[PDB]
Symmetry: D2
Subunit: 383 residues, 4 copies
């Protein structure tokens, strides 16, 4: 069992979720495909980097991410920066022969995402984009039901990602509100999670037809850096909200809606799927649960079942002794890391890859063009 040395670049507060995954994955899944080692962490300056290494349990620290890419003893690069730095870092890591996990969206733009995909697609490396929510056991359970034929053929998909964290106009202008850094707003940040689920559970997209909305068009800068610390107001040039209708390649239909401006909605990732022989509903705010209705039930006892994920369900062998002992965000990252390291050790590939990341970027570009032209747009299809 090989030690694989991880370099984490950035990650913000949420670096805890990355370093949790690397520390806990072999505890959960044993024998492990390989032993992750928290070898080096990069942050914006050496003091921050040193402190993060202390907090997150990394052996070494640096303010120079290139030093990680050029260290022949780093096996894995974890890219957890904002969207504008993914491509440079990933392409450099791909050329140095490193396995890569990258945060979503894959990049700021479709063209930038293509360059990342092109850099990895022919190398002998494992590449993964962090659509971690598809590894919620309930979501993998939905996939299991679908693949088995348990709900028949899929006709219709509804997926949402509703949030309220920026719904106060005094919430400051950060990079997530700046097209030049993020590329898009709700679309890239939260709709991509839902789009990944649609691709996973339903299939590829054929065409989209969308509307983008910006509800809080100006926000205060933070004068003291990234109430009473306001600087000047600046404009928000990204979407707060996206809705899109979808025609799937396989003839199903659907729709995706995401917003940052839904008071009472925290991390409300949902889908509802209607098949010819049943339906499946999911709500990440209650992520331990999957709801499923089978048409085959006797007429006097039909309806949605609330199924709690546990040992009987996908990834159960790595998780808790009983259903509802409690899945949080961390378990999705632990499962993600397990599958990532399994691909590395077995010389194979993982889903979702940079291929998937790039297909989502192509869907995003189509949504933006559709919204601008007020018309259906076809989505080019990589696979």
């Amino acid at each position: 069992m090989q030690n694989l040395n991880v370099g984490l670049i950035g990650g913000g507060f949420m670096g805890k979720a990355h370093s949790l995954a690397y520390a806990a994955m072999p505890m959960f899944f044993w024998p492990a495909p390989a032993l992750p080692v928290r070898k080096v962490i990069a942050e914006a300056n050496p003091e921050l980097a040193a402190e993060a290494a202390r907090r997150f349990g990394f052996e070494n620290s640096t303010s120079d991410w290139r030093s990680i890419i050029d260290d022949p003893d780093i096996h894995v690069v974890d890219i957890a920066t904002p969207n504008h730095l993914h491509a440079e870092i990933a392409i450099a890591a791909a050329e140095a022969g490193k396995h890569i996990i990258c945060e979503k969206p894959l990049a700021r733009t479709g063209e930038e995402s293509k360059a990342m995909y092109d850099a990895v697609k022919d190398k002998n490396i494992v590449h993964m984009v962090a659509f971690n929510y598809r590894r919620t056991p309930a979501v993998a359970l939905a996939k299991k039901y679908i693949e088995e034929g348990a709900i028949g053929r899929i006709l219709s998909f509804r997926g949402t990602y509703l949030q309220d964290w920026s719904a106060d106009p005094n919430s400051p202008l950060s990079w997530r509100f700046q097209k030049s850094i993020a590329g898009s707003g709700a679309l890239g940040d939260i709709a991509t999670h839902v789009i990944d689920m649609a691709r996973y559970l339903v299939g590829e997209f054929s065409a989209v037809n969308a509307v983008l909305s910006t509800w809080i068009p100006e926000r205060p800068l933070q004068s003291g850096g990234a109430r009473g610390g306001e600087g000047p107001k600046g404009p928000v040039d990204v979407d707060d909200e996206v809705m899109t209708m979808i025609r799937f390649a396989n003839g199903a239909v659907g729709s995706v809606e995401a917003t940052r401006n839904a008071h009472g909605r925290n991390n409300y990732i949902t889908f509802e799927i209607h098949g010819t022989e049943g339906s499946i509903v999911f709500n990440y705010e209650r992520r331990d649960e999957l709801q499923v209705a089978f048409a085959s039930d006797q007429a006097d006892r039909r309806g949605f079942r609330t199924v709690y994920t546990g040992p009987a369900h996908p990834y159960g062998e790595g998780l808790w002794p009983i259903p509802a002992l409690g899945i949080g965000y961390g378990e999705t990252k632990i499962i993600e890391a397990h599958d990532f390291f399994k691909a590395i050790a077995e010389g194979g590939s993982v889903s979702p890859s940079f291929a998937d990341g790039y297909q989502v970027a192509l869907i995003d570009d189509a949504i933006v063009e559709s919204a601008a032209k007020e018309s259906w747009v076809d989505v080019p299809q990589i696979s």
Copy 2:
């Protein structure tokens, strides 16, 4: 307090809901605006009509609906036939000076709906279309919150009507699956209920962009009239499912989805409204409840409240002593009849009227054209 003689035309099994409303409305709301009298019922033949009069407690019966229209002692005509007969009947009743409540959709087509509206709009009569679900107390409560400014300005609306009663392909080809009688399928039958709610709670529609789907394109005729009694198969030439994006006149955005093919969904009428200062969610399968989230709550105790309707809420004075004593379908019809008879007695008008019925028909025509042309279509606006 005047006796007002009602003639009910048709109604199917659901005539019980009409005759319940006329019998119970003064019991609930007293003194009543007027005393409904179940004077005469029309059905397809004299025997059926006589039996329905016995079952529903009507004094007289007829197989000739014109005899009701020409009886100068009938004050109110209740039109509960299928969509294809609304216009003839209503226009004849309007010309005879009778007050009219008509089932939805108002007619089979937009043009037919205009003729009904034109026939009544200048008369001194009360005209009402039976979008009864907007008189669910929870829905009137949502309106109260919105009108007060309690959730700020509306940004976004989501409304659905999901059902499964025809999701088995062996369910027979009835008039509801025939464009020549019904005009449309899910659109006219169930999306119109949701569209009425969108107009009530949000405002008028500016434009739509839609997709119509037919999932069960053939059904068996019933050989023994309207398993083992099948006749020949015939085609379904209407939609099983509609989704549409919406631009509202007031600048809000939204979407409406309705289907007959969602296993596990029975009478799942929902809406979710996002305002600048709160959100409102409703589910008719749990109609006693309204969910509302206020942005103004202190940060450590924010979220959706589940509010049970009772004496403190709209129409409470006519209903039960406490919240959750239980609202069913009948109370919506009782409230509807109260407001209808109040307009009659006070020489005024009621909402929704044939104006509202016709505006919905115009929205429906726009959805169908949008779906065919795959493009945005503007909705002409009556008011």
Copy 3:
């Protein structure tokens, strides 16, 4: 079909729920067992009674309920008065050979209830006590699943009725807080509805062990006056009851009811654990029954939410699809259907005065238990 003339006594504005049931029952259940006629209604004075007759649609009105009992053309007496008048009216109605539906609790104590049971048990009349909530279709569905063996043998029952309508100390003193009139408080008014569901779904009670609590000991009044000085008068009943239960069939359980649970409106629940499944019900969401079958496939097991409609009990008489919506009125319609059916067919109906009396014996045992802080056996009629 035969016309059966109903005389309604009392009820306040909720007389409308009775009137609705008699007017609508044949509309819903057709062909109907018989035709209810709203013949006569009694209220406190001639004028109020005539006004109620107009509102509720009765042909005649009276301020003397004995005139209804003595009227040979009245077939059915509906007693909707408070607890202190049920016995006298019911006994006179029985002696005059009327069919009787009586509000719950059947009377204030088991002794007073026994007198009503004795007056009807050997007569050729139909008698029913208005535990209407057992005729919520979801509760009849629970009964169907249990009797078919679908959740196995019942091990355990939890039943609650939680309300908040008097949770405010300023909610005024009414008869419902006065032992001399009501007999008991939460116990009699709302625990009895749950106790009825427990007898219906699980079976007879063998013993109880209970705690009664009064949280608000006085309330504004609106010789109770000569008591007594100042704005308020004493509450001498329970605001809350909880009791543990041994069932005759060896199941265990518990019932809790309260008037002092902020956020709970009409929260009538039960949860039953069987050897092969479980059932959960919440009247605030009365269209639903929740059921978990141990036989489900292991990766797709849990409680399913079943909406009642045509396929479930009473469905043929109700709405054409599930979740069109059951309210309070439909429970009264179903109650009336079964009442008039029993009358038409010369049968009996459950729950009868026998059930009403059995429930009053359970309440007595609860009160005795709470005072002695001891288990009390429940006499089985």
Copy 4:
């Protein structure tokens, strides 16, 4: 910050929940009170122990737990064994001046628990019992609302822990069904978690009145063999407990726990009724707390579903928005945070062995009550 060396004893594969907490606690809560070090782990034999050390990331392994107690470089002992070994290990750990976190129940009986309490109560060490579920952020939030006066004075408490993992008669005999090893069944294993929440949120118990039930009296085995013939052996503990409760502060309530509720997985609930509001919690949906405030405006009153995050207790150490998702591991991380905080600051932590012992006195009183069919006073330590 100081390195504190942990020796973990036992735990089975759920050792991972301990290892996760020690590795992740500083990642979450920063700056951290101290740095946990996974120093040594003990399992049944040298080889299994070395394998566990590799899996869970401990530096050393042993099959003799006394070697950890006697190692002067070990600061913290974590006891994750079954109930029969907690006392001996804890007492030796105390005598050697180690800080101790022990699995619940603290021991098999109140007498055995008293010995552990006595061994630690006057030493300068931090001792904690692993009622981890009280550190679900929603439960700490409940505590916040209660202590601020937001639901008034508590009147009533209902608490449940319903499970189904042994609802099948074929689920095998394990130590958890053997009185000699476990001490009790559902009572000790899961009612204690609820009892801890009741002491935390409401206050001390004054008296209990209880029923214990065994539904499945024998199970397959996988001198218990020389017992004994054939595939199965006897269960001599409770599968289910229910108890009524009088609180020292005059509130009332009840606790019910079972292993035989099909559809219930890890269903840890409570419902508290206060004079000015109510709180409802369900661990199967542990991100939520439901709260109804009587002060809400009358047309917009009901239970609100509050999702925990940065604004609620422990939020600064957890996820950046509500509903990013709390699981079991985060409760263990929060537990560890407070444990190591108390160590770093020379303080104490709740729940301690004092709380563990008080809970064992309540269980004794429940068992006595059930046998006598009587109310039993609970000794207050």
